Design a protein around this nucleic acid. Structure first.
Lengths: 60, 55
RNA sequence: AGACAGCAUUAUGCUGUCU
RNA sequence: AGACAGCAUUAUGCUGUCU
């Protein structure tokens, strides 16, 4: 019968492939400057907050 | 820690249907183009040879 | 001619969490 | 701007096992 560590290494090989795909797709999009509405919302919240935090940093 | 075994079994059942779905799509795609791998050619020749030897 | 599987290369869309 | 994840759609090449 198949030993459990082998099951573990196969899932690990598999997880690695998924991360590689996602990385490839992420970088493709970045290069085309494509974002999803949620990616977009999310960066916009971040940039807004960076501005605000440096407005507390001028209060020094 | 706190994630049931039956969920794991299900998740893997899902992943396995999607793997089978991909073979099917890839397999059929190759059929349309009439494309065989070198090994698929050997196999089919050896089969057709065994079949013609019968008659 | 078919059934099943392994390996490898690779595209696209969206959503959610943390910072 | 990053980190991590989930769903969905989808292309290619090869190898092996059984009949």
């Amino acid at each position: 019968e198949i030993p459990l560590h082998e099951i573990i290494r196969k899932l690990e090989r598999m997880n690695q492939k998924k991360q590689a795909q996602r990385k490839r797709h992420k970088l493709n999009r970045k290069e085309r400057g494509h974002k999803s509405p949620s990616e977009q919302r999310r960066s916009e919240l971040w940039h807004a907050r960076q501005v605000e935090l440096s407005a507390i940093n001028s209060d020094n």
